[PDB]
Design a protein around this ligand. Structure first.
Ligand SMILES: *[C@@H]1O[C@H](CO)[C@@H](O)[C@H](O)[C@H]1NC(C)=O
Lengths: 53, 53, 437, 49
């Protein structure tokens, strides 16, 4: 079954962080995690245009 | 999507005969995006249907 | 010839090993891991899916009575209701008014699609590592599959490689896991024969093809309302569908060291942890007599630029006096600076330049051509870009070498304070010895 | 910048300069069909509204 692919966000490099502008056409799942010993993750369903740090 | 299901036919006297039940039916597609209609450009993921054989 | 090194378990890191066999020119080995797979051993406990309630047509005994009869069905119920007067359709279906009994029964089954849609409760024990390493040296560029324990030997170009047991026994999985489709959950499931209604495990089965069908769904049976043929009942809704909505977050979303949890063979791929001991047995034909390698005398090293970034941000130049054209092998004798090249081309011109990577503000290390050695000291500057899409080419060894700018100051103030203190001690000792007589 | 107020600008209404920074990008068509797939950030005027 065919599925779409979300358009790439806008990435803004900061000091030990980034900021993303997410523009969804419909509810889209967004998650992240750090690649260390204590992962520090998060998941969230995104329904409108938001900015995430 | 809806809150009930109704099926009906048209008998020999041309009178409508219907049955109505309570069904939930909120479906979601596969993947990480809650689209509604397949695009012309996208990905492919395994899906399960009811084959018409 | 026997050699033994220790390479890190990082995918993509270029490791370079140096073998100094007297009477022969040194050799530098290139070997890096391409991918790494970690698989535990899984014992199936049971299989769970959603259930199906089987409800037959009710037996109405006009002008009489009937009795129950226990059966061996899963979660089985049977009841007899005394006085009913059904009114089936267009009539009454009975003739006696209050001497008619209805027999109601129901039982729990397994879903019609439990083969395709089911979860699996497992028990996970000691895991086996298996990596994939590319070896480059001389004129060979092979990559092999190897089990990372001291019990597998692979041969590349006549050399014997054994990749020893990893230095740590870390595992991402716990003792109890659940595997649904492509995702794994560190979940503590109920034992077999101990499920509860409306939660995970309300119906359990030993295997997808088993027949036991243990069931605990709190199915209850009710009395039909007057004047109509039907069997009512009450049941707690399926616990598999409850789990499909409440099953927290998978192991895929949260896993240390960037492990990637994968399909039918449950495995965690490309976890950056531990060290991999390596043992080698090189043939004599893989070396070179010193009478065939250029003789290099009076090597000196001076660094042009240095930037302690993730990439190869340093450059150093080497000056030498050779006697013929040929290729030597270069190496760094510290992990505070990682060379990019394994070999150089030696010319009479007396110049060769190499790139390196570091994280120190002031590194110091020994570089060596095929025969001679030199000491390189540098003053490096931090980068100005914040985020990069790739990983460091160095080991995060930050502590600066002494005789650098930062520690020269510490030594200078230490010397000043110590001179003052010893002056105080000497003055006191002389005064007290004079006053002691 | 894309997706924020001012991603396209004209000096006047009737001008013909039209600065535009909408992060437009282009992609390879799917095997066996005729179409021009692309992605770009949706308008920053509608975001500002
Ligand atoms: C070894 O082979 C791989 C793929 O065949 C290639 O990418 C790599 O550059 C080769 N190594 C050398 C030193 O040429």
């Amino acid at each position: 079954c065919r599925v779409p692919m979300a358009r790439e966000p806008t990435v803004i490099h900061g000091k030990r962080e980034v900021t993303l502008h997410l523009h969804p056409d419909h509810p889209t799942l967004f998650s992240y995690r750090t690649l260390g010993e204590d992962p520090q993750y998060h998941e969230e369903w995104v329904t409108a245009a938001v900015e995430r740090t | 999507p809806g809150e009930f299901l109704q099926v009906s036919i048209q008998d020999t006297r041309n009178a409508v005969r219907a049955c109505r039940i309570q069904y939930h039916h909120d479906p979601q597609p596969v993947g990480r995006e809650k689209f509604t209609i397949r695009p012309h450009y996208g990905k492919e993921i395994p899906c399960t249907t009811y084959q018409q054989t | 010839y026997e050699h033994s090194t220790v390479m890190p378990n990082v995918v993509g890191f270029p490791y370079k090993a140096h073998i100094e066999r007297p009477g022969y020119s040194p050799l530098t080995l290139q070997m890096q891991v391409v991918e790494t797979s970690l698989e535990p051993t899984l014992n199936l406990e049971y299989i769970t899916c959603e259930y199906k309630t089987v409800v037959p047509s009710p037996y109405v005994k006009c002008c009489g009575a009937s009795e129950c009869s226990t059966k061996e069905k899963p979660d089985y119920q049977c009841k007899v209701y005394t006085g009913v007067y059904p009114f089936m359709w267009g009539g009454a279906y009975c003739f006696c008014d209050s001497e008619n009994t209805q027999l109601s029964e129901a039982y729990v089954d397994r879903s019609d699609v439990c083969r395709h849609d089911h979860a699996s409760a497992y028990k996970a024990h000691t895991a086996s590592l298996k990596a994939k390493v590319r070896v480059m040296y001389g004129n060979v560029n092979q990559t092999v599959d190897v089990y990372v324990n001291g019990d597998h030997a692979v041969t590349i170009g006549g050399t014997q490689f054994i990749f020893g047991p990893l230095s740590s026994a870390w595992t991402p999985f716990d003792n109890k896991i659940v595997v649904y489709k492509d995702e794994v959950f560190n979940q503590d499931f109920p034992p077999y024969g101990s499920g509860q209604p409306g939660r995970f495990g309300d119906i359990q089965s030993r295997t997808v093809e088993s027949n036991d069908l243990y069931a605990n769904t709190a199915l209850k049976l009710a009395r039909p309302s007057p004047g109509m043929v039907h069997v009512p009942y009450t049941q707690t809704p399926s616990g598999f569908k409850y789990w499909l909505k409440e099953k927290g977050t998978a192991l895929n979303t949260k896993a240390p060291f960037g492990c990637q949890i994968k399909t039918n063979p449950v495995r965690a791929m490309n976890c950056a942890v531990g060290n991999i001991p390596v043992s080698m047995n090189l043939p004599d034909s893989a070396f070179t007599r010193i009478v065939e390698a250029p003789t290099i005398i009076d090597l000196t090293c001076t660094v042009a630029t240095c930037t302690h970034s993730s990439d190869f941000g340093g450059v150093l130049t080497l000056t030498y006096k050779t006697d013929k054209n040929g290729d030597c092998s270069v190496h760094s004798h510290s992990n505070v600076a990682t060379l990019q090249e394994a070999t150089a081309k030696v010319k009479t011109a007396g110049k060769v330049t190499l790139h390196f990577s570091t994280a120190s503000a002031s590194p110091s290390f020994v570089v060596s051509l095929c025969s001679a050695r030199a000491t390189c000291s540098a003053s490096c500057e931090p980068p100005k870009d914040h985020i990069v899409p790739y990983a460091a080419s160095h080991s995060n060894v930050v502590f600066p070498d002494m005789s650098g700018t930062a520690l020269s100051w510490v030594q200078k103030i230490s010397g000043g304070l110590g001179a003052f203190a010893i002056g105080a001690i000497l003055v006191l000792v002389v005064v007290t010895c004079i006053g002691l007589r």
